[PDB]
Design a protein around this nucleic acid. Structure first.
Length: 138
DNA sequence: TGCATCCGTGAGTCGGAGGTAATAACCATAACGGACGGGCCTTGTCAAGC
């Protein structure tokens, strides 16, 4: 909303008069964890965008009406997106199943790489340092 | 003519395992070409003879 942009302009202007606090990029209050629900939701969003583009094209081309709902829905982009997410992702990893300790430790891994995360070439020293906000959490 | 901005160039060596991509008109008509079938010839064994 434009009220949000006005408030952000107000905070940026007030920071030039020494009031307010600059933020930290490595602080664990500014970093969140995305598990399997959000990534499935995003991939299903992309597949549904493809599916509704297909359905809108199939409705706009067909001049004859009185169709069945099973004729307008093509499930193949959604299946392709779900299979792509579970097969060829950085996040979908071949499981460490050596012993119960390795199996338990692999499910609790917190990675900073992947799509929407980081690049290993763009990984400096400050992103590999230990932050004081990691105390107790990581 | 000096300083700011931009772009291209680099960033250790071996070994193992897993492992990729991922959706979208339809119809006539003639030209083309591989397959299949007889014709003739070339080729490869039996068999008797000096």
């Amino acid at each position: 909303t434009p009220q949000d942009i006005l408030a952000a302009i107000n905070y940026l202007i007030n920071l030039e008069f020494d009031v307010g606090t600059t933020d930290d990029i490595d602080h664990l209050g500014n970093r969140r964890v995305r598990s399997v629900g959000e990534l499935l939701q995003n991939q299903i969003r992309v597949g549904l965008n493809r599916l509704e583009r297909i359905i809108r094209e199939r409705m706009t081309v067909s001049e004859s009406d009185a169709l069945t709902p099973a004729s307008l829905v093509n499930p193949k982009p959604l299946v392709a997106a779900i299979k792509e997410f579970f097969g060829s992702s950085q996040l979908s990893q071949f499981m460490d199943q050596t012993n119960p300790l390795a199996e338990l430790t692999h499910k609790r891994r917190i990675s900073a790489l992947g799509p929407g995360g980081l690049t290993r070439e763009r990984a400096g020293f400050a992103v590999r340092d230990i932050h004081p906000s990691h105390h107790g959490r990581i």
